[PDB]
Amino acid sequence: AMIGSKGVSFFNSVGGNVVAQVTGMGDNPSLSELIGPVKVMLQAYDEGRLDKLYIVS
Amino acid sequence: QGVVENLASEQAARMVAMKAATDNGGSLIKELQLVYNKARQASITQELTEIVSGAA
Amino acid sequence: DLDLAKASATDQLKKAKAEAQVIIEQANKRRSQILDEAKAEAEQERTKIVAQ
Amino acid sequence: DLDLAKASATDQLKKAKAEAQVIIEQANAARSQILDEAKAEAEQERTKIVAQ
Amino acid sequence: TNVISITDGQIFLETNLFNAGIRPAVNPGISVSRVGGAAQTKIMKKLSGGIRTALAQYRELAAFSQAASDLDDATRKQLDHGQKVTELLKQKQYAPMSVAQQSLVLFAAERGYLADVELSKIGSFEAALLAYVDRDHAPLMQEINQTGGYNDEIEGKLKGILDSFKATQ
Amino acid sequence: EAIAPGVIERQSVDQPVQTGYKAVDSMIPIGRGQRELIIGDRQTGKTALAIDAIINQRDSGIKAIYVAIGQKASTISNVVRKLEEHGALANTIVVVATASESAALQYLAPYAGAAMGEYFRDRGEDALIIYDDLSKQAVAYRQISLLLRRPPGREAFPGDVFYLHSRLLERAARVNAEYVEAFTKGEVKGKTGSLTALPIIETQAGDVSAFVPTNVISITDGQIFLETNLFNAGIRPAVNPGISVSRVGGAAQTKIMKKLSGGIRTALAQYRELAAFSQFASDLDDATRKQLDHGQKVTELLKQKQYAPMSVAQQSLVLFAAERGYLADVELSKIGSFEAALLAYVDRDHAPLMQEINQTGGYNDEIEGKLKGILDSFKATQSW
Amino acid sequence: MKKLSGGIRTALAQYRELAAFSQFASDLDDATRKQLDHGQKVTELLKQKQYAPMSVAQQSLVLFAAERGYLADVELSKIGSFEAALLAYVDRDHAPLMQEINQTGGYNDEIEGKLKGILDSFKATQ
Amino acid sequence: SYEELSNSQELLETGIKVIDLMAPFAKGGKVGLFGGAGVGKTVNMMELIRNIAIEHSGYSVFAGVGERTREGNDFYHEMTDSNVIDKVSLVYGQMNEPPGNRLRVALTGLTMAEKFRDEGRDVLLFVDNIYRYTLAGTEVSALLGRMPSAVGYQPTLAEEMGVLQERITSTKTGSITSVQAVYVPADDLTDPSPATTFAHLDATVVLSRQIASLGIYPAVDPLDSTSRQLDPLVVGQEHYDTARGVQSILQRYQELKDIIAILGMDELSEEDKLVVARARKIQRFLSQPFFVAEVFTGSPGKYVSLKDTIRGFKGIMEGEYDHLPEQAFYMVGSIEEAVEKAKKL
Amino acid sequence: SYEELSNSQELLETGIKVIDLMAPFAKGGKVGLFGGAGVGKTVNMMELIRNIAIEHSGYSVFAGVGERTREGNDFYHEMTDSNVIDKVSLVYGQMNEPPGNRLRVALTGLTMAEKFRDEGRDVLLFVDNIYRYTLAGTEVSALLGRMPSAVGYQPTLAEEMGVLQERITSTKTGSITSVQAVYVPADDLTDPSPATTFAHLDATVVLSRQIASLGIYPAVDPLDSTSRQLDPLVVGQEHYDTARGVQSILQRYQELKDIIAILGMDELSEEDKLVVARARKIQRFLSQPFFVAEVFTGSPGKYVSLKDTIRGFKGIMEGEYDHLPEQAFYMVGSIEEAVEKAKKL
Numbered sequence A: 001a002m003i004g005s006k007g008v009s010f011f012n013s014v015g016g017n018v019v020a021q022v023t024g025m026g027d028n029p030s031l032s033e034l035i036g037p038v039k040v041m042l043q044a045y046d047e048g049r050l051d052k053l054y055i056v057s
Numbered sequence B: 001q002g003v004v005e006n007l008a009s010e011q012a013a014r015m016v017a018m019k020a021a022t023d024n025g026g027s028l029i030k031e032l033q034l035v036y037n038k039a040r041q042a043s044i045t046q047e048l049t050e051i052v053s054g055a056a
Numbered sequence C: 001d002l003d004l005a006k007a008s009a010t011d012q013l014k015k016a017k018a019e020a021q022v023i024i025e026q027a028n029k030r031r032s033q034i035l036d037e038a039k040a041e042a043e044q045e046r047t048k049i050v051a052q
Numbered sequence D: 001d002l003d004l005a006k007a008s009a010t011d012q013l014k015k016a017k018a019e020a021q022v023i024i025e026q027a028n029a030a031r032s033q034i035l036d037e038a039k040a041e042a043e044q045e046r047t048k049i050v051a052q
Numbered sequence E: 001t002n003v004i005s006i007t008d009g010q011i012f013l014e015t016n017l018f019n020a021g022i023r024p025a026v027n028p029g030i031s032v033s034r035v036g037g038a039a040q041t042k043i044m045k046k047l048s049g050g051i052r053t054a055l056a057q058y059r060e061l062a063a064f065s066q067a068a069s070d071l072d073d074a075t076r077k078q079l080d081h082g083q084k085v086t087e088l089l090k091q092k093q094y095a096p097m098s099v100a101q102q103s104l105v106l107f108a109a110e111r112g113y114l115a116d117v118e119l120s121k122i123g124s125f126e127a128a129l130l131a132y133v134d135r136d137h138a139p140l141m142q143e144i145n146q147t148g149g150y151n152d153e154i155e156g157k158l159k160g161i162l163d164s165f166k167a168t169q
Numbered sequence F: 001e002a003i004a005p006g007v008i009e010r011q012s013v014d015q016p017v018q019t020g021y022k023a024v025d026s027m028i029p030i031g032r033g034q035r036e037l038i039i040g041d042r043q044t045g046k047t048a049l050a051i052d053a054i055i056n057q058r059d060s061g062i063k064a065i066y067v068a069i070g071q072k073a074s075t076i077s078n079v080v081r082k083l084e085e086h087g088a089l090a091n092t093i094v095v096v097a098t099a100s101e102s103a104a105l106q107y108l109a110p111y112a113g114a115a116m117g118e119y120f121r122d123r124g125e126d127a128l129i130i131y132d133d134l135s136k137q138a139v140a141y142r143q144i145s146l147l148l149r150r151p152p153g154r155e156a157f158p159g160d161v162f163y164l165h166s167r168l169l170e171r172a173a174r175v176n177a178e179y180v181e182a183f184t185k186g187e188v189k190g191k192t193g194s195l196t197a198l199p200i201i202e203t204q205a206g207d208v209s210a211f212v213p214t215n216v217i218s219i220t221d222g223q224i225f226l227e228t229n230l231f232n233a234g235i236r237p238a239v240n241p242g243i244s245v246s247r248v249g250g251a252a253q254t255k256i257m258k259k260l261s262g263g264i265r266t267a268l269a270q271y272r273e274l275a276a277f278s279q280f281a282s283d284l285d286d287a288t289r290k291q292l293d294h295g296q297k298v299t300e301l302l303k304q305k306q307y308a309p310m311s312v313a314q315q316s317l318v319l320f321a322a323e324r325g326y327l328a329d330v331e332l333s334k335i336g337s338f339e340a341a342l343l344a345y346v347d348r349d350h351a352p353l354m355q356e357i358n359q360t361g362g363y364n365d366e367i368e369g370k371l372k373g374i375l376d377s378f379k380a381t382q383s384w
Numbered sequence G: 001m002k003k004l005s006g007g008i009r010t011a012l013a014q015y016r017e018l019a020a021f022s023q024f025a026s027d028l029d030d031a032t033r034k035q036l037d038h039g040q041k042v043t044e045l046l047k048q049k050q051y052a053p054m055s056v057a058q059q060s061l062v063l064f065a066a067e068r069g070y071l072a073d074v075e076l077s078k079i080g081s082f083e084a085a086l087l088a089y090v091d092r093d094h095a096p097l098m099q100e101i102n103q104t105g106g107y108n109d110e111i112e113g114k115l116k117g118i119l120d121s122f123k124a125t126q
Numbered sequence H, I: 001s002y003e004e005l006s007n008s009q010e011l012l013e014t015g016i017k018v019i020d021l022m023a024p025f026a027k028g029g030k031v032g033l034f035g036g037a038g039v040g041k042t043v044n045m046m047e048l049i050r051n052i053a054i055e056h057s058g059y060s061v062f063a064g065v066g067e068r069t070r071e072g073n074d075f076y077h078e079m080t081d082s083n084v085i086d087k088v089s090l091v092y093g094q095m096n097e098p099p100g101n102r103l104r105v106a107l108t109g110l111t112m113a114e115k116f117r118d119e120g121r122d123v124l125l126f127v128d129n130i131y132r133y134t135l136a137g138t139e140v141s142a143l144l145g146r147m148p149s150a151v152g153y154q155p156t157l158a159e160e161m162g163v164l165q166e167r168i169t170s171t172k173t174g175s176i177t178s179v180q181a182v183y184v185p186a187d188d189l190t191d192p193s194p195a196t197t198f199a200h201l202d203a204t205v206v207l208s209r210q211i212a213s214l215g216i217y218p219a220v221d222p223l224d225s226t227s228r229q230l231d232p233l234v235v236g237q238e239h240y241d242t243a244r245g246v247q248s249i250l251q252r253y254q255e256l257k258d259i260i261a262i263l264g265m266d267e268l269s270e271e272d273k274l275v276v277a278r279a280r281k282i283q284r285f286l287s288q289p290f291f292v293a294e295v296f297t298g299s300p301g302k303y304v305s306l307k308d309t310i311r312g313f314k315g316i317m318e319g320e321y322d323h324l325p326e327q328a329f330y331m332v333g334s335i336e337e338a339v340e341k342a343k344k345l
């Protein structure tokens, strides 16, 4: 799951599977935008699609 | 919280990069000025040699 | 769906079978063209050099 | 099976396209050899004529 | 450039190093002797080795390291070794030293005896080593100053002298 | 020494002399009677371009004159051997003034070639004269003037150096039929003669502000700039589309080539500007992306190997393939093989259209339709 | 004029450095923001039409207006019209003060108070 | 003499956007077209001739100082075919002629124009290239025993330049309107020959190779061109305000482009981004196809009135056309058809 | 005479990677080493002597013009110690000599070489410094009553250089291979003396002080070095393609360096970073330990075949060795030695 366009571009060049993206927070980022990708990653995790989750920062 | 901390780290990294860039520009300016001064002296000397030679 | 599948299979088989044959035949045509050109130009060059 | 139509085409098209390239390369080598040998024979004819 | 094309080399003194307190301010990479090692005494030729090229590489490595660094183990050793040998090369004016005292400080430099001594003590280490070797190893200093030769026997003598001094610092 | 034809004796330049180079023939046309400066630094291909222009005339009917000022004799031997390896030598006159010969011979060498070319020009035949390194002629004249104790001007050159090159280059001109009839006393009627000059100037570091380069740029009807950066980048011939210009322009081209290249030259210049602008922007508008990709592919397209002139029909076909968007999907590296395969395919399968284009040079709706059909057939059936 | 011009000198000196920050002045100390919007307005005030010389009274009046912070709330786009209106107002209602300033060029509390009254009375209009 | 001069600055329209806007002509004034080799001086002068001299309804003189013979022949045939040669007299000294002919040829044209003026007529005087006159003087000077000066020019450079230029004036009896092309060696405006002539003209149009490198002709530099007539008393407040606005916008863009080149456009303020966009639009809108250059471009030429130019630049300075692309303006003509190219783009 | 001249394309192999890669030269051709003061012209010439003398059994002529006497004595002694002296004729006029000896000394060496050539042999000519000949001409020119030219050189500079250079040519009766070192005053490659020499040479190797300051030897500049022989017909396609690829990669690195200087490498695109990484490896690989330089470096010299250098450079450009550090390539003879150095870093 991807936050920010730089990661989007780099991992599209690498060709890794990206399931979700959000961009354009700039300064003063909001949790409201973040609710989405975390929701879909949770959906993947609890349905068995994902077994462990890491935050990279 | 991770997002906010990454934003703060980005700001710190940009500050450092801009300091480095300012120092690099300041280092480039003086070398350009030395080259310009060499050219400035050379042009005066060449043109005065030409003027003196032309007064045969 | 069964009709579409059989029709598409036949169409793509026919198309690929034609196209690959065309490609190989025209590659043979290009090879023959190069060979003929070389064969002619060899004697053209020799006929220039003898007059030289 | 319908989804293999593209697969079955790639089993023929790209392979023939690649083979055309080596078919052309062998003719290129033949052309180069023919022209080089023609030059090498013409020079030995010219030298003989001028030496006469 | 006219003068350089005549002489057999040049010693380039750099104003930046002189301002930085590195005096003598001999800039390697530009400075060179074109007769090379043939002039040197055997012992000095052996101990000096690649010092000038190591310093020339280190002075560029330190310039690049200010921006970013990789291979931070080997580069760290190179940087600290270069910095300590530059600190060792600085010498006061009106203060010449014979080939003997020169030979042994280069031995301490290149054999790794200075590797774990801090920068703020390099000059004091050098002065203490000179005073120490002046006391009881005088015959070896005389021998080195008479003949600038190198051999395994004086090699072992210098090694033992360095070990004993490093013990009693 | 002879005067150039006056104003009333000349006729407008409206006929092509084909260089055989895609870049030069497209962006910078040369006409029969034009003076086109070739200018650039050392070892950038100035001599190669001119000798290829001489080689291309073997079957166009234009006589060729190659004047060598101050070059070493072995270079002239190699040039003559290369002209003799093709059929060009029998159509060419070579005037030689090696570096060893006295300054008088070197400085007079261009005028002798000018008179030899003027022989053909007054009888109604076309001649192409290459002045190689007029800078060396200026150097020889400076030596002569300084030995005569004449007052040196700027850069130690004599003051009248401009008059030398100006009166030399003004002989190259196209004369109307009336002047030819008057000269021939009625033996030749209805034919106009022309002399085309291609002077070569060497710049030291791209510095066009030097005395001789400024004079020659002022005199000539245009210049072709070759520069070291493009040559090292692999763009050979290293023709800079921005600073190079032809003052005769479209009137010298055949109709089809004019139609194709007119947009091309300024499109490439503005592409270079945009590529300067865009270099760090992550987001490109689709129009800007089109311009950048098209410019990169066109820049790749104009590269051409030495001693391989292309006929008008082939250049027209490749420029049509570039202009009408067919090149777009092809990856950049394959563009050269695309061009070679297209040339071979069209030569084997569509010879009559090539003959028609080469002979007529005309352009019409049916011509465009046939070219479009050829492009579609090649792109479908063939492989690069 | 000697009393007043030091403010202009220092305002322009400060404004010169902040011109680099002008591109992204949205994120700045409010003190720096005030300095920037004061330097900009002073620079806008200094422009003048050809063939229109201003007497010492008028230059001193507009300089007093700029220095004492009366332009703080005036928009950069409108500075010139403010200046013209002020000059017309003082030429209409307060000519004797301008006459005295042109005759003497003196400065004291009795003059600064009069100028304060002039500017407060004008600011109610326009 | 001083008493005979006149100041009748009657505005003259040329039909070129940048010339009419930035550097308006005046009847009886002197106009100089500065530029290096290959920037468009000759085609600009041809367009100016086709516009004014045909409609002028009066005699005109063309002085071909140091011109190329081919170009002089082409111009003569152009005047003959258009059937206006009967109103114009031509004096030609070509490059191949010895330095005396090039040195003195301009004075012959000046003498003919002065003869026409003293009759009381209004005449147009066109000079092919003033610079070549000084070059002929420099050629002859060294042999004449004079010592060199400056960049190797003759010492009397300014005296000769003043002597020639001061005869081209509009007196109370008649007016002479003159357009002069001035060669700029290596595009260095610092050179004494272009530097001296600057003071003698009234409107100065500077062609820059830097603009010409982009292919956007007429390649007139708006930030260097100027005219004495560009003040409110003549042009009216509308024209003056429009010209000043365009100048300021282009000046701001010239600074912003330096930031853009290295740091990239995202570092600018959104207002600075808008300024960059609208300035880059105006820069292209100043271009205009001339129908004396169809041979080069292959496109029809356009003629524009002053009012339409003013309205178009006003509209581009405001928000009316922020949505059009940059290429939508290139070599278009009036603003009323830039939208059409945008739709076509 | 022009008739007597003979053409030859037999490539002459050298042990030096950069020279025979970028600027190969043929038997009987001219080679010119351009450089400033101290960049290493003499060392390169000595290495060329050592390598070329291996496969050439004919006579050789060495003409020292205005160089150090010490170098002449060392060369003579090392020739005598190797018992090869009996094949070499040595003409020495050094810098200590008055101007006449330095001016005329080169012609004596040329006359000996011409005597050996007309006998029908294959000769090798080495000129220690061709620049001093023109310098002696400049010194004596003023006293001969000739006005100065250009930068104060004699007016006859070009003729004086040409008359000397034209005699060093291979002929149908015999061949002369020539290597000439060309001093560059004040590192100004645009000076008239270096500028004139460029046209007389077949292959030109330019040495740069900036590269030498990096410690890279030989300090050959690959973007200025050029040879007539770099032609696909003679060298073949693979060598040509490798050379042009190296040239393009280094040109791209030069283009990127200005951005790198200010913004640092981090701003580059991921392909640009790969270009930089490969260019630095190429620059390192061009270095080579010389047998004559062992007295300086200590490390033993290397001889590199043309096949090994072309294979190694093609492998580097293809990216096979992208996992190795830069230092692995510094001062290695061949690519296998480079990978062996990598194991110990």
Ligand SMILES: Nc1ncnc2c1ncn2[C@@H]1O[C@H](COP(=O)(O)OP(=O)(O)OP(=O)(O)O)[C@@H](O)[C@H]1O
Residues within 6 Å of the ligand: F041, F042, F043, F044, F045, F046, F047, F048, F049, F202, F236, F237, F304, F305, F306, I199, I227, I228, I230, I231
């Ligand atoms: N189109 C081309 N493609 C590839 N190589 C080329 C091309 N044109 C020229 N060259 C090569 O460039 C080199 C220099 O060419 P050329 O001798 O014509 O240059 P020049 O500018 O006349 O040089 P000089 O200053 O020595 O007279 C030669 O090796 C030649 O083969």
Ligand SMILES: Nc1ncnc2c1ncn2[C@@H]1O[C@H](COP(=O)(O)OP(=O)(O)OP(=O)(O)O)[C@@H](O)[C@H]1O
Residues within 6 Å of the ligand: E004, E005, E006, E032, E033, E034, I035, I036, I037, I038, I039, I040, I041, I042, I043, I044, I183, I217, I218, I288, I289, I290, I293, I296, I297
């Ligand atoms: N392969 C090499 N390895 C190490 N050092 C080298 C190498 N080649 C040249 N040098 C360095 O070049 C320096 C000067 O070389 P050299 O004497 O040949 O210069 P030069 O260009 O002939 O100078 P000059 O103009 O003074 O005659 C030497 O001191 C040596 O250190």
Ligand SMILES: Nc1ncnc2c1ncn2[C@@H]1O[C@H](COP(=O)(O)OP(=O)(O)O)[C@@H](O)[C@H]1O
Residues within 6 Å of the ligand: F245, F246, F247, F248, F249, H035, H036, H037, H038, H039, H040, H041, H042, H043, H044, H217, H218, H290, H293, H296, H297
């Ligand atoms: N307005 C224009 N439109 C199209 N091309 C132009 C224009 N101005 C200049 N050019 C190009 O510049 C070239 C030289 O123009 P010209 O005016 O003859 O040069 P100069 O200014 O040196 O006389 C022409 O061939 C033409 O292609």
Ligand SMILES: [Mg+2]
Residues within 6 Å of the ligand: F046, F047, F048
């Ligand atoms: Mg050449």
Ligand SMILES: [Mg+2]
Residues within 6 Å of the ligand: H040, H041, H042, H043, H044
């Ligand atoms: Mg023009």
Ligand SMILES: [Mg+2]
Residues within 6 Å of the ligand: I041, I042
């Ligand atoms: Mg040397």
